Amino acid sequence: QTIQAIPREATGRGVSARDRTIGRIPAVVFPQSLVSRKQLLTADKKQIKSIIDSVGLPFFCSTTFQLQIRAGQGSSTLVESGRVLPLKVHRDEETGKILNLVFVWADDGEKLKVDVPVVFKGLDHCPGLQKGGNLRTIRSTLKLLGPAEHIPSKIEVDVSNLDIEDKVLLQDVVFHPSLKLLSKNETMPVCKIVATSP
Amino acid sequence: LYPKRTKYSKYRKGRCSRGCKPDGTKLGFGRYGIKSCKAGCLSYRAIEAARRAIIGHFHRAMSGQFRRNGKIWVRVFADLPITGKPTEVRMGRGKGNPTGWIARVSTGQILFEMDGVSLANARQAATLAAHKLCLSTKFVQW
Amino acid sequence: GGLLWKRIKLTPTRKANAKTRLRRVWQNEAVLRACGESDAPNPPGASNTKSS
Amino acid sequence: RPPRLFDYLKPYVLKMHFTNKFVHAQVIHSPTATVACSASSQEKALRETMDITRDVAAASKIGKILGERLLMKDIPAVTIQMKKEQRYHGKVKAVIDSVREAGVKL
Amino acid sequence: TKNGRDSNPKFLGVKKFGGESVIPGNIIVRQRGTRFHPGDYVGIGKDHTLFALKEGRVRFEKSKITGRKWIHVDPI
RNA sequence: GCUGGUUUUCCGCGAAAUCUAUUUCAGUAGAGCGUAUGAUGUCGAUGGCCCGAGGUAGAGCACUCAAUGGGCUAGGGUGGCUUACCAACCCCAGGGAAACUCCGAAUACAGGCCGUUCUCGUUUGUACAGACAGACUUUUGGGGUGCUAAGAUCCAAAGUCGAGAGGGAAACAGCCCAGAUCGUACGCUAAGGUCCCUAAGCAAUCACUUAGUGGAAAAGGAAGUGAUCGAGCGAUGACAACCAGGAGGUGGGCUUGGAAGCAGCCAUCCUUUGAAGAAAGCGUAAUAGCUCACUGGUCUAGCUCCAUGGCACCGAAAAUGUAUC
RNA sequence: AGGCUCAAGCUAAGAUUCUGCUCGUGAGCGUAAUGGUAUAAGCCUGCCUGACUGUGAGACCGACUGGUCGAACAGAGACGA
RNA sequence: AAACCGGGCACUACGGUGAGACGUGAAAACACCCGAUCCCAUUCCGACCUCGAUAUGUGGAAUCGUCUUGCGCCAUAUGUACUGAGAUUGUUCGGGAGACAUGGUCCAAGCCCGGUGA
């Protein structure tokens, strides 16, 4: 899923306006360093608007992405490339349009602080679930440190044994080493269930 | 539905805004939700009427609600006491008597949020609130 | 509604004068933003006189 | 910070303090680097001569020593900056009385 | 029993800004309590007015700790 | 202090309807604003640099008030250990506001320094007065209002008018352009316009709509038309379409004076397995049945829904006569 | 002149309670509200009476009548080493 | 000597601030350990301050300076919110936060006084 881009030399209103209006997204790659320094690009709005829905995760930014950064003419000219993570997608309130794509570099294997959801899986069979047990899933997504290489695609929690009045905390999540949670204390419950009314 | 406890009262009406806080929102508490496309104002009876509509809807489709509960949050609360003079009076000589609260609704607030086990019978109650509400809303989700 | 302030409709032959003043101020700020120094870098005789 | 300069610049502030081995005191300038006068019992020439280098005796001695090293060095007046817990009783009373009777006026 | 009262505008505030010269006796600011504390060569009234004491420019100083400001004078 | 009247001519300049006060509103004084002249002024006009405390729009919850869900519970209640019944506190999220501020812009403003500039346009002396009832912007931002803005009222800054004629808005103080010294059957624009009334193109180039939309008015409804990214489909045949049962447990179990699919509840489970739910709708006093999800070949081909969106449509009724280009 | 640091939260303890840790302006200031303030303007002890006569350079605001702050001078004084 | 350590002054928020684990003195230094006699301490009390004594006891990690995580600010990115001047009843030109993101939590500068060989 190589994304394509063409640079821009812009700041705030005035120019990003025409980019959007012809159909183009003002995006920014930069390295995890400081001043922060990488080129200032434009993805194509067609490319990005289709991509977020295709993943089906409104946090699709959990996934490392790869950029052709065309500098030249035509459909492209092979030029500088990018291995960057999406750390932020500024989706417009108005209807679902897009405003900004934030890309931080991770090509080196250097660690990052990223987003992973907690999709509920065991919901087919669970003792409280078959008593009817329903819940308030306090946490649907979380932030995990860790390298660029072994990045997970998501966390698919195992709620099969959600006891009638028990809960899956943060510790019970299936991590990997060097993906130290370490940014939240594991005392935050990520679900429960309670027998409310048959 | 009412800021019943002590408040300053007689609030300046204040003109309505062209926008919300600029970051595209996410959802606060539930799977599916609804948001206001256009700013404006909603009266407490209006919002409560939409809530009646939705609760009673899932209750009707107890068939999808008799499992447990189908939890819903409404995230707007009446704020400003809309005041008004009687129907026949010389303008002036004071201000109106407080006769109903109102709630500023911006261009991206989430009015309704909920997790009804059926996406179908949740989007089906999506369009069943803009009928009883003042503004034009939109079916969003997590 | 009492005193009838008509609404002139923006019409192609007014779009004319719109784009006119547009290209005019375009030249204007163009040569100003050129003058970011005491130099003379503005190609001789930008139209300025077909302005009509 | 302390004095909140008012009308007449008044450099050469005297300030003193007491480790429970030696009494130290200074009269410092507004440039506040070149200590205009520095009187301590810790000095080379004063470890040995002065014996009881923590009581009011060493205190008043240091006061007298200074006051003379001051009147003779042409700084005929000085302003006191007691630290936060000080109080004109005892170990600072000695410095004060001694430099006030040395000739100086405060 | 009804609203609609006010008071003569007392005209507090800050007159002299950073750089504007002064002369002894010339009031700089009028405050209710002490919004700015006096700096260099400055007195204080009953109403805690701040006025200059010697000729010269003025500047502000912002103690980064506790955010307390001082208005101090730059004389010769 | 109220109403009306004040008779010749030319030229020069040229205001105000704001503020304070008042047995004050219909007045009049004092400031600001006009004029004449003289004196004292590079004073003023302004742009650039620099530097100066700002706490509004926005914003946020770090405080006060109102506040939603959740985690664990003091403490309650309820029976006798223990409670899907209340749970404070505390914590997690979420984020309201003229009288809240962890934050916080664009401005405007104080000043010095430089250019810019003039027919001093400045300050001030000395004599004259006028004015103290102002309107409006389908301007923009604010209090009262009808409900959120009456050609209202009352303020913030702007402009026009008033005291401004002239071309556009069919006609039109308050909107667009623009300041008439005078003569001229001269000339290039401005404002807006070029099928005709009316001076000037049925101009050209690329597409869209066929509603007189244009040439008035919303929630909602509605395969309109043409473009655009997706995607599902397809010579293991894509859809249209012909031809065929929707079975036996089964008439399930329950109700029931009657229920087999359908007055009406549980049940969604058995199996045959070509299909099949304890038949969807309709009913039949139960019936039966359909057809329904659910069918094999033939079809012979680009089909279908996703939105980016563009211009259409419907809602859309007044009074003498089309009467909203 | 000098000394003293609040109010609230947690342990004990639970009363005019008590004493440390955390709190940071939320206490306090005769009196409404706001701006003030941790050396403090607050609370305590001693002392007294400058809750002075006669002037005030300069400024702030205002139609005007006016009103506000003031470094400084002379005096008789108080507190303080 | 150059330089280091300690003590005092000074400067500084990237130079603060809690927090916790450390590494810890005696070589010198600072602190504490111990009393309360006169000066001081208490609205009761050496708890805190003070006065009076420690000849080499402890760093009680009491403070302290030390070692790294972690504690606010500093710096800046993309944008948006707002807004200036404009009228194509806002198709132009500028200015641009809060929050989200990143990184730093300095390179540096004195003066005196004691000490480490000098």
DSSP B84-130: E--SS--S-SS-PEEEEEEEEE-SS-EEEEE--S-SHHHHHHHTTTT
Burial label, D56 (beta-carbon count in 10 A; 0-12, 13-18, 19+): middle
**Residue B98: C-alpha distances to residues B9, B49, B86, B87, B95 (Å):** 9, 21, 11, 14, 9
- A113: its two tokens: 């602080």
Pairwise CA distance, residues C51 & C37, whole Å = 27
D43 contact partners, CB below 8 Å, separation of at least 6:
none
Give the type of residue at D54: R
Paired with A100 in beta bridges are A90
Helices (H) and strands (E) in chain C, counts: 1, 0
Among A112, A58, A125, CA closest to A85: A112
Among E73, E28, E23, E18, CA closest to E51: E28
Residues 44-73 of D with CB under 7 A from strand H: 44-45, 47, 52, 54-56
Among A99, A112, A23, A21, CA closest to A65: A112
Spatial contact of B129 and B137, defined as CB atoms under 8 Å apart: yes
Pairwise CA distance, residues A15 & A20, whole Å = 9
Closest alpha carbon within chain B to A117: B142
E52 contact partners, CB below 8 Å, separation of at least 6:
E16, E22, E23, E24, E25, E26, E28, E41, E42, E58, E73
D35 contact partners, CB below 8 Å, separation of at least 6:
D26, D27, D28, D29
B99 CA to G55 C1' distance (Å) = 66
- E15: its two tokens: 């007159």
- A71: its two tokens: 């500098």
Q: How far does D8 lie from chain E, in Å, by closest CA?
A: 9
The C-alpha angle B65, B68, B73, rounded to 5 degrees, equals: 80
- E11: its two tokens: 């005209």
- E76: its two tokens: 């010769």
A178 CB neighbour count, 10 Å cutoff: 11
Dihedral (C-alpha) A118, A123, A126, A130: value to the nearest 10 degrees? Answer: 140
Pairwise CA distance, residues A188 & A145, whole Å = 17
Spatial contact of E49 and E68, defined as CB atoms under 8 Å apart: no
Pairwise CA distance, residues A173 & A182, whole Å = 13
Give the type of residue at A163: D
**Residue D16: C-alpha distances to residues D49, D76, E23, E62 (Å):** 20, 18, 38, 30
Residues in A closer than 8 angstroms to B35, CB to CB, are 93
Q: Which residue in this structure is represented by tokens 């190609």?
A: C43
- For residue E15, the Cα-to-chain-centroid distance in whole angstroms is 8
Pairwise CA distance, residues A75 & A82, whole Å = 18
Q: Is the CB of E75 under 7 A from strand G?
A: no
DSSP conformation class of C28: H
D7 CB neighbour count, 10 Å cutoff: 10
- B116: its two tokens: 């009804």
Give every strand in the sheet of A141-146, ordered side by side. Answer: A141-146, A112-119, A155-156
- A139: its two tokens: 């946490």
Query: Would you call D28 helix, strand, or coil by DSSP?
Result: strand
**Residue D77: C-alpha distances to residues D68, D80, D100, D102 (Å):** 12, 10, 10, 11
Give the type of residue at D99: V
Spatial contact of E56 and E76, defined as CB atoms under 8 Å apart: yes
Residues of E within an 8 Å Cβ radius of D? 38-41, 53-54
- Strand E50-51 relative to strand A65-68, pairing: unpaired
Q: Nearest nucleotide to E52 by CA–C1' distance?
A: G71
Dihedral (C-alpha) C45, C46, C50, C52: value to the nearest 10 degrees? Answer: -130
- Strand D22-28 relative to strand B110-114, pairing: unpaired
- A28: its two tokens: 């920014």
**Residue E37: C-alpha distances to residues B85, E13, E43, E57, E67 (Å):** 50, 14, 10, 17, 11
DSSP conformation class of D105: B
DSSP conformation class of B62: H
Among D81, D8, D3, D67, CA closest to D37: D67
Paired with D23 in beta bridges are D18
Spatial contact of A104 and A31, defined as CB atoms under 8 Å apart: yes
- Strand D22-28 relative to strand B80-84, pairing: unpaired
Closest alpha carbon within chain A to B108: A93
Dihedral (C-alpha) B42, B45, B51, B52: value to the nearest 10 degrees? Answer: -150
Q: Which residue in this structure is represented by tokens 């660029």?
A: A148
Residues 81-120 of A with CB under 7 A from strand F: 95, 97
Helix D56-71 and helix D91-101, axial crossing angle in degrees, nearest 10: 30
Spatial contact of B67 and B136, defined as CB atoms under 8 Å apart: no
For chain E, how far is it from start to end, CA to CA, in angstroms? 58
Q: Is the CB of A50 under 7 A from strand F?
A: yes
For chain D, how far is it from start to end, CA to CA, in angstroms? 20
- E32: its two tokens: 């209710």
Q: Partners for E (CB, 8 Å, 3+ pairs)?
A: D
Paired with B105 in beta bridges are B40
The C-alpha angle B110, B114, B115, rounded to 5 degrees, equals: 145
D53 CB neighbour count, 10 Å cutoff: 21
A198 contact partners, CB below 8 Å, separation of at least 6:
A132, B66, B68
Spatial contact of A158 and A131, defined as CB atoms under 8 Å apart: no
E12 CA to G52 C1' distance (Å) = 31
Question: Backbone dihedral region of A104: left (phi > 0), alpha (psi from -120 to 50 degrees) or beta?
Answer: beta
Pairwise CA distance, residues D84 & B54, whole Å = 68
Q: Nearest nucleotide to E25 by CA–C1' distance?
A: G58
- Three-state SS annotation for D52-81: CCCCHHHHHHHHHHHHHHHHCCCCCECEEC
Q: Nearest nucleotide to D28 by CA–C1' distance?
A: H9
Query: Would you call A155 helix, strand, or coil by DSSP?
Result: strand
Q: Do D4 and E40 touch (CB under 8 A)?
A: yes
Q: Do A93 and B22 touch (CB under 8 A)?
A: yes
- Strand G, nucleotides < 7 Å from a protein CB: these are 2-3, 34-37, 39, 41, 57-62, 68-72, 81
A136 CB neighbour count, 10 Å cutoff: 13
**Given B23, B26, B68, which is nearest A134 (Cβ)?**
B68
Query: Would you call A136 helix, strand, or coil by DSSP?
Result: coil
